[PDB]
């Protein structure tokens, strides 16, 4: 039920829906999410997009 995640790896998004992010970035999940890819907002860069859940872990 945590909403804040940290990026565990750098990720280059392939599509316009997805967020690129770098290892260590703090990401907050936005709205209702299900499945494997979740809409997120980077607290580090301000960008938004879908993230792959296997690239992140719950964070403070």
């Amino acid at each position: 039920g945590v909403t804040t995640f940290v990026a565990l790896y750098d990720y280059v998004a392939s599509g316009e829906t997805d967020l690129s992010f770098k290892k260590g970035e703090r990401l907050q999940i936005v709205g209702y999410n299900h499945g494997d890819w979740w809409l997120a907002h980077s607290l580090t860069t301000g960008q938004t997009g879908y993230i792959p859940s296997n690239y992140v872990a719950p964070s403070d």
């Binding site: 790896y9 750098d10 990720y11 829906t17 999410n33 299900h34 499945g35 494997d36 890819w37 979740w38 879908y50 792959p52 859940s53 296997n54 690239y55």
Partner: peptide, 12 residues
């Protein structure tokens, strides 16, 4: 709905 349910990328 499809955007959430897409295959994941492999880990690096």
């Amino acid at each position: 709905v499809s955007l959430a349910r897409r295959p994941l990328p492999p880990l690096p």
